[PDB]
């Protein structure tokens, strides 16, 4: 016998059925299921518990799904891809609720507003951040930056759009001003993913310089906004948009890695807590289950790995 | 002892070399010579494993039967634990595991009549600057119109049997000349 | 505490339970080639899944230019392989 930490059917589960590089993966905020997609364009849904049966599979993108996020109430899945389109998928219906056909190049990342009216921030190879409101065909905001933007998130109040890209500097756009109120400078190479802490105080940002830097995005900060730097993971010649994510208790951080290892760092000490093997290619996206200590990792190897971790 | 120097194997007594005496110390033959036969060895029961001969050439199989006490009778009206049948979970797990293991035979027997490899070589003079190679292994297309390539009417002796299991008999019963 | 190397790992050990280095001296007799982690007679073969497009790009850069990006996982500082002088220039 051995210790157990979750309702998983086994301490590690291997989920198989994707037909191409899995670029993105996310849990439902209610903890019931998870959704994953990538170069094979289908979006696969998996239950977190029991047999983890692939209970649904949405199709419709005409391109790789680069990024994929649940809305906070779990009633809709936002997804975006190389078909220049953001789509919102209704969970109960399984159907495209909206199709924001207004980007002019590949959409690299997407993030729905955490609360209030549902807004969808998106960043694209056209260089623009756009915020789309479900109620209008036209975007609410278009923030033209000069160079291709690869990652985006709102702040927690959903009134600043944070983005990064080929220029390595993160922009922070203030949605009442329509100006960059400040920039976060420090990455040596292009950003591959940005993720917002549950409390909203901090963001992490992954970059092809093989570091994750934690930034303080609170309105007042008494000095430097760079909180700390994590290292250990690696980005290879495939130049995938390796994502990053927060533990729901914020004690731990993850980032994708090209070295096959699933990395977890402790937020306070910056020590690597897990460096789990088992993938056979780039671990493109990593996420934590919102209620229970379970790790998701999605590989370029077409495999999804679910497993327990001791979140002590 | 720091005033003393050893030089003969007897000078150490039953102990080993002295680290405080910076002379080359060989408390037995150890290190004098230079570096086919297995070495006799005590077991965890403190007996000496002369029957280690019976274990050579085996895949760590169960035929450790080489002691008298494994040929003597054991418990009658046994303690009901090990002697209980395996449960339904065990027979189910064994059936599925063995099924797919011999499915691989029969499917490959009635058929008898992108992918990459990352390689971490040990010869680290290597590919240029690289701890690792990565290679695309394609499968060469078979011509369907090509007959069997090689003769297999060869016959060779069977592999020798696995080494003798010790015979483990009851002692001989003396035959009288009447028998 | 620690978990030794196994055909597959079930229970997701922490970092310190897997990657803690083996303590003590090392054989004078075996060469570094012979001490190395291996799986076949000559190295550690393991399956891989690259992007097909970028893999082809890196072949042709090495063949035609003399340098390529380093294929290793955990490449560290050695970002380029081959004629690294051209890669930097």
């Amino acid at each position: 016998t051995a210790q157990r930490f979750s309702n998983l059917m086994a301490p590690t589960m291997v989920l198989l059925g994707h037909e191409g590089e899995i670029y993105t993966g996310a849990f439902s905020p209610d903890g019931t299921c998870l959704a994953t997609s990538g170069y094979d364009q289908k979006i696969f849904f998996w239950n977190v518990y029991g047999e983890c049966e692939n209970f649904s599979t949405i199709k419709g993108h005409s391109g790789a799904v680069m990024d994929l996020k649940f809305t906070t109430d779990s009633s809709s899945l936002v997804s975006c891809g190389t078909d220049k389109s953001v789509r919102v998928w209704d969970m109960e219906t399984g159907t495209c609720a909206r199709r924001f056909r207004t980007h002019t190049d590949f959409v690299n990342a997407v993030h729905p507003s955490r609360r209030g009216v549902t807004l969808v921030a998106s960043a694209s190879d056209d260089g623009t951040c756009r915020v789309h409101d479900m109620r209008t065909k036209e975007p609410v905001k278009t923030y033209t930056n000069r160079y291709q933007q690869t990652a985006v998130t709102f702040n927690d109040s959903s009134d600043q759009v944070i983005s990064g890209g080929i220029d390595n500097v993160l922009k922070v756009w203030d949605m009442r001003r329509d100006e960059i109120t400040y920039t976060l400078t420090g990455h040596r190479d292009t950003i591959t993913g940005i993720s917002l802490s549950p409390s909203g105080k901090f963001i992490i940002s992954n970059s092809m310089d093989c570091t994750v830097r934690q930034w303080d995005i609170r309105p007042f900060v008494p000095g430097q906004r760079s909180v700390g730097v994590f290292a250990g993971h690696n980005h290879n010649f495939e130049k995938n948009l390796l994502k990053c994510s927060w533990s729901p208790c914020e004690r731990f951080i993850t980032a994708g890695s090209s070295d096959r290892f699933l990395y977890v760092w402790e937020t306070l000490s910056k020590k690597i807590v897990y460096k789990l093997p088992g993938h056979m290619g780039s671990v493109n996206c990593t996420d934590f289950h919102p209620k229970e200590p379970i790790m998701l990792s999605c590989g370029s190897d077409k495999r999804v790995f679910l497993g327990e971790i001791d979140m002590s | 002892r720091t005033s003393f120097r050893p030089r003969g194997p007897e000078d150490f007594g039953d102990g080993g070399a002295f680290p405080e005496i910076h002379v080359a110390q060989f408390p037995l033959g150890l290190g004098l010579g230079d570096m086919n036969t297995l070495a006799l060895q005590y077991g965890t029961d403190g007996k000496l494993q002369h029957d280690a001969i019976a274990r050579i050439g085996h895949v760590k199989d169960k035929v450790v039967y080489s002691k008298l006490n494994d040929m003597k009778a054991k418990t009658w009206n046994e303690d009901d634990d090990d002697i209980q049948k395996p449960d339904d979970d065990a027979v189910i797990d064994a059936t599925e595991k063995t099924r797919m293991a011999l499915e691989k035979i029969v499917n490959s027997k009635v058929a008898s009549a992108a992918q990459y490899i990352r390689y971490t070589p040990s010869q680290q003079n290597g590919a240029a600057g690289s701890q690792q190679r990565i290679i695309r292994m394609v499968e060469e297309q078979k011509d369907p119109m090509e007959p069997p390539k090689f003769k297999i009417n060869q016959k060779i002796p069977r592999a020798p049997p696995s080494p003798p299991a010790p015979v483990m008999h009851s002692p001989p019963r003396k035959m009288t000349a009447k028998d | 505490i620690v978990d030794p190397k196994t055909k597959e790992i079930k229970s997701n050990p922490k970092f310190d339970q897997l990657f803690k280095p083996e303590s003590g001296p090392v054989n004078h007799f075996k060469s570094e080639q012979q001490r190395s982690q291996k799986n076949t007679l000559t190295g550690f073969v393991e399956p891989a899944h690259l992007n097909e497009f970028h893999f082809n790009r890196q072949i042709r850069s090495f063949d035609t230019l003399g340098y390529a990006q380093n294929p290793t996982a955990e490449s560290g500082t050695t970002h380029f392989v081959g004629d690294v002088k051209k890669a930097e220039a």
Partner: peptide, 11 residues
Amino acid sequence: KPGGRGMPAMP
């Protein structure tokens, strides 16, 4: 199906 993590090579 359930599974486990194959240990890769290391530097």
